[PDB]
């Protein structure tokens, strides 16, 4: 139950470890707000052209 | 400046930057700058 993430030119193929490095620091706010939750998780989606 | 970041907003500059690594004499550079078509300059830059 989280708002969509900013893929920003980064393909994450199924069952293929990948790294994401956005230059903006606002997505880190969402990554630190999930630390108190019991299970922390995130979804990965794809962008259009 | 990676090819996977899609940050190459100016491809002409990327092809020129790649041709800049060539050690060819200045004349070759001038001749490549004279080239107007795109496959010729890419083909020649690769040749250099």
Distance between A44 CA and the closest CA of chain B, angstroms: 18
Question: Cα(B22)–Cα(B47) distance, rounded to whole angstroms?
Answer: 9
Q: What is the resolution of this structure in A?
A: 3.8
Structure tokens at B43: 């083909």
Using a CB-CB distance cutoff of 8 angstroms, which residues of chain B are in contact with residue A9?
Answer: 4-7
Q: Minimal Cα distance from B6: which residue of A?
A: A9
**CA B19, B22, B20 angle in degrees (round to 5)?**
40
Question: Cα(B19)–Cα(B7) distance, rounded to whole angstroms?
Answer: 19
Tokens 């707000």: give the residue. Answer: A33
Pair B22, B48: CB distance under 8 Å: yes
In our burial notation (b when 16+ CB lie closer than 10 A, e otherwise), range A5-39 reads eeeeebeeeeeeeeeeeeeeeeeeeeeeeeeeeee
Residue-wise DSSP of B30-48: HHHHH--SHHHHHHHHHH-
Which experimental technique did the depositors report for determining this structure? cryo-EM
């Amino acid at each position: 139950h989280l708002p969509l993430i900013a893929i920003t030119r980064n393909p994450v193929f199924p069952r293929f470890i990948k790294i994401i490095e956005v230059k903006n620091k606002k997505l880190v706010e969402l990554l630190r707000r999930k630390v108190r939750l019991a299970q922390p998780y995130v979804g990965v989606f794809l962008k259009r052209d | 400046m990676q090819a996977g970041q899609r940050v190459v907003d100016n491809p002409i500059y990327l092809s020129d930057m790649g041709a800049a690594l060539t050690g060819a004499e200045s004349h070759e550079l001038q001749d490549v700058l004279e080239e107007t078509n795109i496959p010729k300059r890419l083909y020649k830059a690769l040749s250099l």
